[PDB]
Design a protein around this ligand. Structure first.
Ligand SMILES: *[C@@H]1O[C@H](CO)[C@@H](O)[C@H](O)[C@H]1NC(C)=O
Ligand SMILES: *[C@@H]1O[C@H](CO)[C@@H](O)[C@H](O)[C@H]1NC(C)=O
Ligand SMILES: *[C@@H]1O[C@H](CO)[C@@H](O)[C@H](O)[C@H]1NC(C)=O
Ligand SMILES: *[C@@H]1O[C@H](CO)[C@@H](O)[C@H](O)[C@H]1NC(C)=O
Ligand SMILES: *[C@@H]1O[C@H](CO)[C@@H](O)[C@H](O)[C@H]1NC(C)=O
Ligand SMILES: *[C@@H]1O[C@H](CO)[C@@H](O)[C@H](O)[C@H]1NC(C)=O
Ligand SMILES: [Cl-]
Ligand SMILES: [K+]
Ligand SMILES: [K+]
Lengths: 401, 37, 396, 391, 37, 37
């Protein structure tokens, strides 16, 4: 009659000191391991950059001024040059002969074509380019359309080309661009629209190859008259899917899931079901918005969605994020001495060089690769270890009875 | 007269249709826009 | 066998108990993106302290020497280095013949002669929502009369943001008004060689120490500031060195310093500077030059014995990432010149644009957790004992 | 059978926790605190211009004229010259070698003498209210030429510290880059620069400055603020990690030290000489050697070659998180004052004057250290006991 | 003659009272200040 | 004629010796340099 209490005393301590660890299991806890090391090889990121000015003044034709003149605030609602014009009398004449629609027959007009043709040409802006002593050409830049207009992406890596790498830190083993923003080609600003800009220079974004560029929201700036240094540090974050975390691709418009991809997606669907068209920089296969559609539907609907609406788009957290810690710095260019030299080399005035020339150095530092990853704190393996150790006693007692 | 969705409400901040507001945009002119809480 | 097992248990447990006694602490990390984000307070100040057009004859009389606009004998210094147009205007102002000094108050001087948010603010938005000067709470600091967006003190709720990018952040366009900058004829704590503004991004419940911990923004550039909120939590002793006041509501290293600076400056000059808490008589222009400034400068830059601030158990840090572009473009210059009735050259020297926002990844937490608590102590050990017992029983 | 059955089951699990041991796992402990005392880092800065125009003598122009693109391969002033007619005359009388006998010439001497003088550039300097002089800056040679290092902490001087955050308790420099002393740029070489200003690097005392590769920039006409945060990283040596401890040119092991080392050996075994800024004890390269061997061999090694130098990961790394920002200088008002104080024109002050504030913030000390996850003790904990039980 | 605490010691770097030093300020004129180790 | 290691190959991008390439430098003139994979 004591054996029955040696079996009940054995079964008791089994579940009694066992149920305390299974509750910790169904909590689905997660440890976040950190590791900041230096990789022997480093997959250099994609570098998308855009000019703040959207359309070249010398590329805007009479027909273009007719279709998108009002959108660019170069014309009023009645196809006339606004009286509020604030330009010199030299561009006024050139612009008036262009706004002369007497006996003019409007040819067909396409926005995507306008951006592509009237946009800034990487072949004129790129005065110099290197990547690890390797000289690169405009053919290394993949054309990408975004809110700013016709932009470009170095080391885009999609399309059949392999993504570049770097194995050493410092400027010597990174991207170095010398651009000519061409202020002389900047459109006159006579009004305030989503296609006009008070600023001069470029907007840049450093992102993973498989992450679409949201350059108008998440980009940084680079000004003319300065050589900008950008020390970067690649940070890779990994999250756990639920039951452990909140993270988680539909593959509707983009290959990999990205917060940006998700937003670009929502912006597109929204702008489509509101205007029955998409903006030049948007995915999908909807009719491209016309200059008129931009002013009266496209721009407004998009601005509202992004700046005012917080109900429509609900983007979940990605299970894989690649973040680049940027550290900027600059020096003046040109020096009082090298000015007259750069002026002759590019057949420009000395003053011009100071207002237009730009140099950008994007690279990594010594410590270049950091990882913040969520690991499963308590897995099934280790669970059965301690709970399994209590079985050897319940089995040995189940025989004596 | 009533100004519809996404339209210019310049000098007419009160001529928006039902459920709209005259919203001043950060980079452009005012626009009648769906009112939000 | 039973004996061995007992030994083993012993080996296990004593150590375990000790471990439990060292008060160890694990530091859990977590860098996520919050659905809602409490946008920080943005305090900014103009580098110039007093508007040249607001300095009256009486003001020049009381604080003329402090601003290096007058010598120790109420005269315009011979070392003056200004044009002959401001010299005349300043001489008619420094004419004290048959002049009776009216009362003068520093706090009033800063408030009135300071820069007006209503003149500097040419534009302001926060998530497409247009904001006015009434959104900025006046805050006094070493630089003079400053301002705080989203101050969140005073009965107003603190703003939030739920999306990343410039579109969902603060965007200011200021006019620093160099034409209103006081002539610099000497080097004092109230004079500045630089032009532009000084900004500080801080938690609502953390007083701004903008002269020490602020960053800079220059005219002629649109500055982008990608931020990342980092919340750090420390453990109080026996586990850590931190802790959970009189002048301020919440404990802050800054609050602690502002506190010390005040007490110190008070028990040394029998007065406080305009930007200081407490309830002491405000220092006079004379007191500033001969007691206030010196005593404060020394305390901050030279003294490391007086103030002993402990580590806070709760710290909110904002990782800032700056960048800029020129303004105006050669084209938009003549437009901005007309819109604000200023010269083209003026726009380039005075106009400024600041975009403060968060990126995708916006919320990181570094928190110290109790590594070994009572629970696990009685558990693991306890469990082990139980196991031992069961074993014995089996052996029996 | 049931006893010898769980025996063969606990003999496969007994050798299981040991599998995790010969795994040599490592936990990476994090800790971001604020230190009561903080060892202020070394601040090396260099002027973008290499040689002062007023210090280049006739003999110097003769030996290194071609290197500076001031002369062609025939000791003549290039026709592609793009300078005013005032410097042209001064430079022509200097390039007049008729009846001229070439005196000996030494690069290291040239850099040292013709370089920029900290005593002329330093218009102001403070470190925690303590005013400092040019004698606080240790001369260090690098690719940019004659540079300087504040708080170098070498020569036996103790390394400075700071116990409070903010500009008030950090370095504050006001430099005069002297564009009027900048060499005319008539060509593109490794000794010419399109930019004006300075290059700075914040590094540990015992880490040589690789300022041309890892430095940041500071421009004239701006006061630059740099909020720093010291980050100390510790790695474990193998069997746990890939790192290593102390290394012959340098005292402590550094990725930079390793590279400077390789660059030196390489440049030596290729040109039979070393560049002015390199360690060791090899004959210093001549201006001719620079153009035809030194520069090319070095540029290639750094930008193109990825086989020669193989630097391992250090077990101890000190990283400084930098955060920059700036404001214009001078203000329209303080311009005419600074012009008089330094006997320069108002325009000059705007193009040459510079102010740099390097300091720490509240949170100033972060450590990321790799600890041995499962040490011997832990291993002992399980295997033996199991064995006993088995027995 | 002896210059007291917090006072201007310009052109008089040695006229400070007992326990004081002529300290050159980062932004202003020299000031007699309590000597520190 | 054959241009040796580390030498100027300006206007002569094809006159490099065996195992060399005419490499355009980031900051200076072209240089005959050991060819790499
Ligand atoms: C994270 O994403 C990258 C693609 O950018 C991929 O190469 C990598 O395998 C992913 N890591 C994990 C753990 O899924
Ligand atoms: C140089 O510029 C001028 C005026 O801008 C232009 O007319 C001329 O064609 C250019 N010269 C060359 C050689 O391209
Ligand atoms: C940390 O401080 C904030 C106030 O800024 C407070 O809301 C939060 O509850 C605090 N967290 C803890 C763990 O005390
Ligand atoms: C424009 O500026 C001038 C001179 O600064 C001033 O006199 C005039 O009152 C201003 N005009 C308007 C309409 O405010
Ligand atoms: C790390 O290196 C520093 C020298 O910069 C040294 O003082 C410290 O003791 C080292 N730490 C370890 C754990 O070796
Ligand atoms: C001031 O500058 C001028 C011209 O640069 C020079 O000749 C003169 O010697 C300087 N004056 C003093 C007092 O140094
Ligand atoms: Cl959106
Ligand atoms: K967008
Ligand atoms: K971190």
């Amino acid at each position: 009659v004591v054996w029955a209490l040696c079996f009940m005393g054995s079964l008791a301590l089994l579940a009694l000191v066992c149920t305390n660890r299974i509750q910790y299991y169904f909590l689905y806890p997660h440890v976040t391991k950190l590791d900041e090391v230096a990789a022997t090889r480093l997959t250099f990121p994609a570098v998308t950059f855009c000019n703040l000015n959207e359309f070249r003044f010398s590329r805007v034709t009479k027909n273009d001024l007719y279709h998108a003149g009002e959108l660019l605030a170069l014309l009023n609602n009645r196809y006339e040059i606004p009286d509020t014009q604030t330009a010199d009398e030299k561009q006024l004449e050139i612009l008036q002969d262009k706004a002369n629609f007497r006996n003019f027959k409007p040819k067909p007009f396409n926005m995507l074509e306008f951006y592509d043709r009237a946009g800034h040409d990487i072949r004129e802006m790129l005065l110099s380019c290197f990547f690890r002593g390797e000289q690169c050409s405009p053919e290394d830049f993949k054309v990408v359309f975004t809110r700013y207009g016709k932009c470009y992406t170095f080391n885009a890596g999609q399309d059949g080309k392999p993504r570049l790498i770097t194995m050493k830190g410092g400027t010597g083993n990174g991207l170095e661009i010398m651009l000519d923003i061409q202020q002389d080609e900047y459109l006159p600003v006579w009004g305030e629209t989503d296609e006009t800009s008070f600023e001069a220079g470029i907007k840049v974004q450093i992102h993973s190859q498989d992450e679409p560029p949201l350059i108008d929201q998440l980009g940084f700036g680079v000004a003319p008259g300065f050589q900008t240094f950008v020390s970067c540090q690649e940070q890779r974050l990994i999250y756990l899917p639920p039951p452990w975390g909140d993270c988680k691709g539909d593959s509707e418009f983009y290959d990999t899931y990205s917060i940006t991809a998700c937003r670009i997606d929502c912006e597109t669907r929204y702008l489509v079901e509101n205007c029955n068209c998409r903006m030049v920089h948007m995915p999908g296969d909807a009719p491209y918005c016309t200059p008129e559609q931009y002013k009266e539907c496209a721009d407004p609907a998009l601005d509202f969605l992004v700046e005012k609406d917080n109900e429509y788009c609900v983007c979940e957290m990605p299970c894989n994020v690649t973040r680049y810690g940027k550290e900027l710095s600059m020096v003046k260019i040109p020096s009082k001495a090298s000015a007259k030299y750069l002026a002759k080399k590019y057949n420009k005035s000395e003053q011009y060089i100071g207002e237009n020339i730009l140099v950008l150095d994007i690279f990594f530092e010594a410590l270049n690769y950091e990882t913040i990853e969520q690991k499963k704190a308590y897995e099934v393996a280790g669970l059965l270890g301690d709970i399994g150790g209590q079985m050897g006693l319940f089995i040995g007692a189940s025989i004596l009875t | 007269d009533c100004i519809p969705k996404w339209k210019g409400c310049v000098n007419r901040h009160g001529d928006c249709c039902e459920g709209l507001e005259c919203w001043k945009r950060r980079r452009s002119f005012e626009v009648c826009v769906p009112k939000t809480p």
